Design a protein around this ligand. Structure first.
Ligand SMILES: COc1ccc(OC)c(NC(=O)c2nnn(Cc3ccc(Br)cc3F)c2N)c1
Ligand SMILES: COc1ccc(OC)c(NC(=O)c2nnn(Cc3ccc(Br)cc3F)c2N)c1
Lengths: 247, 115
C-alpha cells in the first residue's frame, strides 16, 4: 500500500509525500511494528533478517531523515523479499506446497550447476569483449558477461550486432566474429539451455514420483510440530475422538 | 472436436496441461508480483514500468525470455538514466535465473511429466 500510493523515488513522511497522510502514517506504523515484532519473534531464517532490517529503513523517515535514494533503495529490496518469502508461508497449504518444493528443488539444482557454467559464460564474455569491443553492448568486460548471460535466452541481437556492423565494415575481426556467433549459438542457447531443461524435467519427474505421499508427509509434519508446541490442556479440549460426515 | 477419434486425445492433453498451469498459478502470481513491484521501483522512469499494473504485465511478458535488456538496462545505463544502477542490473540477472530459466523449465517439467 505504501508503495503503490506513492511515486517511487519521492521522499515521504507521515506529514505527506514530498513533490494520503493517514494511510501513509498507519502503513508506516504497521511496517515498523511488524519489523520490531519480527526482531522479537526472531534460507528461510536469512530472508526474515533481510525483510525486517531493510523494512525499517524504508519507513525510517518517520524518525530520522534519510536521502530519498536510500529510502527507496531499501524499499526496492524489502518489497521484493516480502513477496518472495511469502512463498515459504504458502508451503503450508496442500495445493501449493508441492509446486514450491519443485521450485526449490530446481533452484537448488541450477545453483549447484552454475559453479561450472559461470566459466562457460566467462569464456564467451571475455571472447566477445575482444571481437565486438567497439559496440556499446560490449564496451566493458562485465557488460559483455551480462550481454552473454542475456543471450542465453536465445535473443542473440544477430541483426543489430553482427550483420548490420559487417555490412558497414565496423567488425574488426569479421570471419572470427561470425565463427564465434555460430559456436555460441550451439553451446549456450542450445546445449546449455537444453541441459537445464534435461535436469529440470528429470528432477521434477522424481518429485512427481511420490508427490502424493509428500503432500501428506508435509501435513503430518506440520500438525505434529504444532502438537509438540500447543499446551496439553488445549489438545484435550480440542481433539474429539470421533467425527460424523453427511455426504 | 473431443468427440472425434484422432482429435480427442490432444484436447485431453490440452485440458490436463491447462489445469496443471492454473493450479500452479496461485503460487507463481506472488513470484511475478515480487519482480513486478521490484522493477516498478528500480526502473520507474521508463514507460514500460510507469504504473504497477503495467510493470506486472511487463514482467509476465518477460517470462518468454524477451527481456528487452539493451532497450531497458544497458542503453539507459550508458546515458546515466538508471536511478539504482548496480541494484537494477543485479535484479535483472536474478529475474532471468528465477523466471525465464527456472519457472519456464518447471512448466516444461510438469508438461512433459503429465503428457
Ligand atoms: C570443453 O571445451 C570444448 C569442448 C569441445 C569443443 O569442440 C566442440 C570445444 N571447441 C569449441 O567450442 C570451439 N572450437 N572451435 N570453435 C570456434 C571458435 C573458437 C574460438 C573463437 Br574466438 C572463434 C571460433 F570461431 C569453438 N567455439 C571446446
Ligand atoms: C523463495 O525465495 C528465495 C529462495 C532462494 C533464494 O536465494 C537462493 C532467494 N533469494 C533471491 O532470490 C535473491 N537473493 N539475492 N538476490 C539478488 C537481489 C535481490 C533483490 C534485489 Br532488489 C536485487 C538483487 F540483486 C535475489 N534475487 C529467495
Amino acid at each position: 500500500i505504501l508503495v503503490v500510493n506513492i511515486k517511487p523515488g519521492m521522499a515521504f513522511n507521515s506529514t505527506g509525500i514530498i513533490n494520503n497522510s493517514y494511510l501513509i502514517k498507519t502503513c508506516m506504523i504497521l511496517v515498523f511494528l511488524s519489523s520490531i515484532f519480527g526482531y522479537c519473534k526472531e534460507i528461510s531464517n536469512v530472508l526474515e533478517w533481510i525483510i525486517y532490517t531493510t523494512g525499517i529503513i524504508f519507513v525510517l523517515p518517520l524518525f530520522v531523515e534519510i536521502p530519498a535514494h536510500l529510502q527507496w533503495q531499501c524499499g526496492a529490496i524489502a518489497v521484493y523479499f516480502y513477496w518472495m518469502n511469502f512463498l515459504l508461508y504458502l508451503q503450508r497449504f496442500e495445493n501449493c506446497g508441492i509446486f514450491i518444493v519443485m521450485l526449490e528443488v530446481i533452484l537448488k539444482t541450477l545453483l549447484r550447476s552454475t559453479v561450472v557454467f559461470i566459466f562457460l559464460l566467462l569464456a564467451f564474455g571475455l571472447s566477445f569483449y575482444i571481437l565486438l569491443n567497439l559496440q556499446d553492448p560490449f564496451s566493458s568486460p562485465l557488460l559483455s558477461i551480462i550481454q552473454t548471460f542475456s543471450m542465453m535466452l536465445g535473443d542473440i541481437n544477430y541483426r543489430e550486432s553482427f550483420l548490420e556492423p559487417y555490412l558497414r565494415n565496423e567488425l574488426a575481426h569479421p570471419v572470427l566474429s561470425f565463427a564465434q556467433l555460430v559456436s555460441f549459438t550451439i553451446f549456450v542457447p542450445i546445449v546449455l539451455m537444453n541441459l537445464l531443461i534435461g535436469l529440470a524435467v528429470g528432477d521434477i519427474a522424481d518429485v512427481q514420483k511420490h508427490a502424493s505421499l509428500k503432500r501428506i508427509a508435509m501435513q503430518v509434519e506440520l500438525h505434529t510440530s504444532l502438537e509438540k508446541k500447543l499446551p496439553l490442556w488445549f489438545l484435550r479440549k480440542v481433539d474429539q475422538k470421533s467425527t460424523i460426515v453427511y455426504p
